[PDB]
Design a protein around this ligand. Structure first.
Ligand SMILES: N[C@@H](CCC(=O)O)C(=O)O
Ligand SMILES: N[C@@H](CCC(=O)O)C(=O)O
Ligand SMILES: [Cl-]
Ligand SMILES: [Cl-]
Ligand SMILES: [Cl-]
Ligand SMILES: [Cl-]
Ligand code: NA
Ligand code: NA
Ligand code: NA
Lengths: 253, 253
C-alpha cells in the first residue's frame, strides 16, 4: 500500500515512449524507453518507488463523449486502474475537472505540421479553404481545443474537421503518414513537430503556436503520490535536468 | 499544527470577496462575504478546518517580472505566507510552474467589456485601431495571456497595451470605471463581465470568449490540504451546489 509498485499507464509516442530495439523478445518494464521513461526512472530513483508500465488498451489520451464518459488514459486514472499516466499528457481545464496532474514537465503549444510545398503561413490560411485537408488526433487535447473554441477561425476549422471522417486520425503516427501521402496538414503539439521535422526533412511547422500549455504526469484526483512527484520535477528543472533529457531524445539539408 | 487554522490570502473583488455592510466596525473573518467566502465556509464545514483571512498587501493576483520574481497572491503562496488563496484566481500554465491549485470551481474565459455605443464586435475590431483604447488588469492572468500570445491579433493588442501607460489598470474596479468615463474597452474574465453588465446597463460584452479556463483555490506546491479541498469541491459540483452559489451572488431595460 505504501510500498506497492505504482501502476503506470502510457501509450507509444515517439520520442516519449517507444519499444526499445532488441533481438530478444522483451517483457515488462524493459520493453520501454524514451524521454518519459527516463523521467519516470529518475523520479523513481529520487523518490524510492517502483512501478509496472502498462499500455492503455484503447490507445487514446482521452476525451469525453456527449454523455460525459471518458476514454483513454484519462479514463484509466478516473477509474483508478492506474496510479500515474506517464506520457505527453496535456494538462487542460476540461481534464482538471476529472483528474489531477503533476506540475508541467514540458511546455508546448498547438501548431501545424505540413509538407514543404504550398506556402501557407497560418491556421487562417487553412481555415479559408478545403483543398488542403486538415485535422488532429481523435480524442486528444488538440481535437478538444478546436471542439471547444469560440474563436471564429478555429470554429471554422472544427466545423470542417468534425464533418470529414478522414480528418481525425488515430494517433500522431497515422497523422504524420497522412501529411506525407496526401495534401493534409496535421494540427499537432509543437515539441512533437520539432522532433518530426528534424527527421522528415520534407515536413515543416506552419505558423506559430496557437496556445502555450504543458504536459504533466496524470494521476487520479487526490493521489497520495502526486505531490512528491511535483516537488521532484521542480527540483529536476531547477538544475536543468529536463532540458538535458529533451536534448538527449530530440538530438536536414 | 494539523489542527492549526489555515492562513487564507485574498483580495477584494465583487462578487467573490467583498466587505460586508454593517454599522459596526467589523474585524477578522466577519469582515468578508461573497461567493468565494461562501465556498470557503462550506469547505471548512465539510472538511473540519478553521482559517484566518488576510488581504494580500499589494492587491495583485500575481505575475512574474523580468527576473522571474512573482508578486500578488501567487507570491504569498510561493513564500508559504498563506496556505490557501481563496479568490477568483485563474489556473494557468505559467502559475502551475510555481504553485498548485485545487480543481477548478468555476469556468470562465477572456472577453471584452465596453460601453454600448460604437458597435465593435470582436477583438479583431479593437486590434486594428487605437481610438478606442483597451487593456487589462496589471499583473493578472489576462495581461499575461496577451503578453505570451503568438496569435497575430493578440500580439498587436499586447504591443499596444504594453506601450500605453494608462492601458493596464490596477484592478477590475479601476478598469470598469475607465470603461464608464473614457472610450476604453477592458479585457476581462467572462463571469465577471456577466456580473457587471447586469448591474451597469450601459456596459456590454463584446464578442465571445477568447479562451476557456478555470478559477481554483491556490496553494503552495506540496500543500497537505489541497487534495481534500479538491475532492470536496468535486462533490459540491456533483450536487450542483456551486451553480446554486453562483446564482445567489449573480442574481436591465
Ligand atoms: N498530448 C495530447 C495528444 C496529442 C494531441 O492532442 O495533439 C493529449 O494529451 O491529448
Ligand atoms: N482572475 C485573474 C485576474 C483578472 C484578470 O486577469 O483578468 C487572475 O487570477 O489573475
Ligand atoms: Cl502492456
Ligand atoms: Cl529543466
Ligand atoms: Cl486583512
Ligand atoms: Cl455545481
Ligand atoms: Na525484440
Ligand atoms: Na482548528
Ligand atoms: Na462598518
Amino acid at each position: 500500500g505504501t510500498n506497492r509498485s505504482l501502476i503506470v499507464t502510457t501509450l507509444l509516442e515517439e520520442p516519449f515512449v517507444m519499444f526499445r530495439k532488441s533481438d530478444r523478445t522483451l517483457y515488462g518494464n524493459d520493453r520501454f524507453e524514451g524521454y518519459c521513461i527516463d523521467l519516470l526512472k529518475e523520479l523513481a530513483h529520487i523518490l524510492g518507488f517502483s512501478y509496472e508500465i502498462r499500455l492503455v488498451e484503447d490507445g487514446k489520451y482521452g476525451a469525453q463523449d456527449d454523455k460525459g464518459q471518458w476514454n483513454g488514459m484519462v479514463k484509466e486514472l478516473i477509474d483508478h486502474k492506474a496510479d500515474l499516466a506517464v506520457a505527453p499528457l496535456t494538462i487542460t481545464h476540461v481534464r482538471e475537472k476529472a483528474i489531477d496532474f503533476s506540475k508541467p514537465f514540458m511546455t508546448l503549444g498547438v501548431s501545424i505540421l505540413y509538407r514543404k510545398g504550398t506556402p501557407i503561413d497560418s491556421a487562417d490560411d487553412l481555415a479559408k479553404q478545403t483543398k488542403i485537408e486538415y485535422g488532429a488526433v481523435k480524442d486528444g487535447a488538440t481535437m478538444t481545443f478546436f471542439k471547444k473554441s469560440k474563436i471564429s477561425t478555429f470554429e471554422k476549422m472544427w466545423a470542417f474537421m468534425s464533418s470529414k471522417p478522414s480528418a481525425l486520425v488515430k494517433n500522431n503516427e497515422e497523422g504524420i503518414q497522412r501529411t506525407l501521402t496526401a495534401d493534409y496538414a496535421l494540427l499537432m503539439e509543437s515539441t512533437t513537430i520539432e522532433y518530426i521535422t528534424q527527421r522528415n526533412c520534407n515536413l515543416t511547422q506552419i505558423g506559430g503556436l496557437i496556445d502555450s500549455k504543458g504536459y504533466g504526469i496524470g494521476t487520479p484526483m487526490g493521489s497520495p503520490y502526486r505531490d512528491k512527484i511535483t516537488i521532484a520535477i521542480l527540483q529536476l528543472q531547477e538544475e536543468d535536468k529536463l532540458h538535458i533529457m529533451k536534448e538527449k531524445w530530440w538530438r536536414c539539408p
